């Protein structure tokens, strides 16, 4: 009958066990081979620890030289949360364009929730090494030690690589810029505004090479949210305690409009919030006639249950083109990277005990 | 084992031996209503069938329950659980049998693609000598 040694579902490719070496990941010039890396990571392949550490540290060195507030000219494809959905990230670049001929800006949250977070980091960092001046990465609230230890990113690193690789990621995440000034019109951040931030210079004078503090303007950039009644403003306070995140604040429609007018900004582009269509246009500013706030979310079918769309924002030729895309298949992991023996053994001992009890009566 | 237990198991063995053949067939095990929906019945029967004739004689029936004695340490519980997965009884858990045994337990709770993927991952993450199969030592380190 069915072989006890050969694989039953032969349609599933057996993942490669080899770990790529430095000579196989970096070419003669020292540039990463993103084609090799993409194909290998899509098969759930792994790199040698030293190679993974080299990608993380080399990418961190490029990030380390960048300012807190990036200056990015149009055209550019702005992207929201990825949350470790590496196979949806492959679809994202198909939708937005290849980084070989397309400028990109990512608003953070590359890790946690999805179970391919380290693949997302390695591939984005390699792209950052390859395209240091056309592909840009901002920091999200999940690129920190506080959250990756509470969620699955640290466990993911220890299963696929080592805690040393995790530790290298934490130091790299500290180098991530906090914000971007895009085409002199849009302030691009992960979370939103801060009561301690009223000008662009308030962002520039920040010290970002650290773990995000529990309070302060750096925390607010990464954690803040618009009011649930944004636009329908009955709460006349500009900043109130964020009861959903447990820290930072909610910011109101008057707060955003005042900031935009004080800094001559058209809109604020942010992420940090799952959306059914992958995007949300907030109430227009009476001063500009343009939406004061835009949320972008690039993780489709979030947590494999939300069944939401994802979108990126392609700004080119004075056109704000929203591009939606659906989720893609990905290999299956048991929750919290549990193996099948630890998963099934309590069921095994239970059913064999029931049988023995009913046979012996 | 205990003499009182030996006599009780002989009485139960007779009630299970419906055709009075001196050996328990798979159909005779399935006659019990609690075992009709237990997805591990066929695995335990094969484990007890140490000679491979498809049936369980009284000698196999005694030695099968002897392993479930309270005088067995945790290793005795893990060795029996190991044999649940090791269908071909070669001392190792291979890919096909691990999938098949898991498929019996999960039924429709996982599609075949998803199950094959986590079976692959477990074998890769647990095989420490490169043979491609999971020995009992490798099985202990995981559980």
């Amino acid at each position: 009958k069915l072989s006890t040694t050969d694989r039953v579902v032969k349609a599933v490719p057996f993942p490669p066990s080899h770990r790529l070496t430095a000579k196989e990941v970096f070419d003669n010039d020292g540039k990463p081979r993103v084609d090799i890396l993409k194909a290998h990571l899509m098969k759930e392949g792994r790199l040698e620890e030293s190679v993974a550490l080299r990608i993380i540290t080399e990418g961190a060195s490029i990030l380390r030289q960048e300012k807190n507030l990036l200056d990015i000219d149009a055209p550019v494809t702005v992207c929201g949360d990825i949350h470790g959905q590496f196979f949806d990230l492959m679809k994202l670049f198909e939708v937005g364009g290849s980084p070989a001929n397309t400028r990109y800006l990512f608003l953070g949250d590359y890790v946690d929730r999805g179970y391919f977070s380290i693949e997302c980091v390695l591939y984005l960092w390699a792209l950052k090494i390859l395209y240091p001046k056309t592909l840009f990465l901002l920091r999200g609230n999940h690129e920190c030690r506080h959250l990756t230890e509470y969620f699955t990113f640290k466990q993911e690193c220890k299963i696929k690589y080592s805690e040393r690789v995790y530790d290298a990621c934490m130091d790299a995440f500290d180098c991530l810029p906090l914000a971007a000034l895009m085409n002199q019109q849009f302030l691009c951040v992960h979370g939103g505004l801060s009561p301690e931030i009223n000008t662009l210079d308030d962002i520039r004078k920040l010290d970002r090479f650290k773990e995000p503090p529990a309070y302060g303007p750096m925390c607010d950039i990464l954690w803040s949210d618009p009011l649930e009644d944004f636009g329908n403003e009955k709460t006349q306070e500009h900043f109130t305690h964020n009861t959903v995140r447990g820290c930072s604040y909610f910011y109101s429609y008057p707060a955003v409009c005042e900031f935009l007018q004080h800094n001559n900004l058209l809109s604020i582009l942010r992420a940090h919030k799952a959306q059914d269509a992958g995007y949300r246009m907030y109430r227009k500013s009476q001063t500009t006639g343009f939406p004061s706030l835009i949320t972008i979310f690039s993780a489709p079918n979030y947590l494999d249950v939300y069944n939401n769309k994802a979108a990126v924002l392609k700004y080119e030729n004075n056109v704000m083109n929203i591009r939606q895309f659906n989720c893609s298949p990905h290999p299956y992991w048991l929750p919290n990277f549990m193996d099948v023996f630890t998963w099934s053994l309590p069921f095994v001992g239970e059913k064999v005990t029931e049988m023995l009890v009913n046979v012996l009566n | 084992m205990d003499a009182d237990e030996i006599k009780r198991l002989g009485k139960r063995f007779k009630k299970l031996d419906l055709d009075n053949s001196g050996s328990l067939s798979v159909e005779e095990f399935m006659s019990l209503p609690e075992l009709q929906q237990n997805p591990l019945v066929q695995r335990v029967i094969d484990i007890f069938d140490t000679d491979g004739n498809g049936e369980v004689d009284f000698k196999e029936f005694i030695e099968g329950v002897s392993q479930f004695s309270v005088k067995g340490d945790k290793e005795q519980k893990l060795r029996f659980a190991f044999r649940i997965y090791d269908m071909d009884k070669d001392g190792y858990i291979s890919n096909g049998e691990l999938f098949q045994v898991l498929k019996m337990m999960v039924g429709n709770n996982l599609k075949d693609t998803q199950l094959q993927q986590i079976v692959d991952k477990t074998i890769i993450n647990a095989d420490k000598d490169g043979d491609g199969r999971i020995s009992f030592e490798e099985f202990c380190a995981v559980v």
């Binding site: 549990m338 998963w343 | 999960v106």
Partner: peptide, 20 residues
């Protein structure tokens, strides 16, 4: 429990390209 289960210039114009 009969089966093992899984554990728990002018203004910019805004345009849309729906999925697929």
């Amino acid at each position: 429990n009969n089966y093992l289960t899984v554990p728990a210039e002018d203004l910019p114009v805004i345009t849309i390209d729906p999925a697929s």
